[PDB]
Write a protein that binds this ligand. Structure first.
Ligand SMILES: C=C/C=N\C(=O)[C@H](CCCNC(=N)N)NC(C)=O
Ligand SMILES: [Cl-]
Length: 130
């Protein structure tokens, strides 16, 4: 129905706003763009599903997220990709990991404070109906 379509539009608006707030945060610059194969040619071989915040915006716009849970899977993938690709004790890897955990924790905290649980539940029920 049009009211279901309005629901998903509201979801996209909400997700774009959360993703913009993450993308403008200086700590999260490394997560804003896909990794350049030049810098890092083994990236695309180690990490089987790369994900970054510009890809997340593209997916919102392509209507790939019908629930906040589905969007959070992608935030979680940005984080887990960084933990897996940079697992060493050296400062460069520890800084990326700390920033990745911070991305994840920040996205979850914004959603906890600003997503209405009944709105998520509505999205879930429409999704489940299709
Ligand atoms: C789960 C993500 C949380 N953050 C981190 O990864 C950071 C940075 C890596 C250092 N320690 C190891 N991870 N071994 N660690 C903290 C909080 O000290
Ligand atoms: Cl830096």
């Amino acid at each position: 129905s049009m009211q279901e379509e309005d629901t998903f539009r509201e979801l996209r608006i909400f997700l774009r706003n959360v993703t913009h707030r993450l993308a403008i945060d200086k700590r999260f610059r490394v997560f804003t763009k896909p990794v350049d194969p030049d810098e890092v040619p083994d990236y695309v071989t180690v990490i089987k599903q790369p994900m970054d915040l510009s890809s997340v915006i593209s997916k919102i716009d392509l209507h790939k997220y019908l629930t906040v849970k589905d969007y959070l899977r992608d935030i979680d993938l940005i984080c887990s990709n960084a933990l897996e690709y940079n697992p060493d004790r050296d400062p460069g890897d520890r800084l990326i990991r700390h920033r990745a955990c911070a991305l994840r924790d920040t996205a979850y905290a914004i959603i906890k404070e600003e997503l209405d649980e009944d709105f998520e539940q509505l999205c879930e029920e429409i999704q489940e109906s299709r």
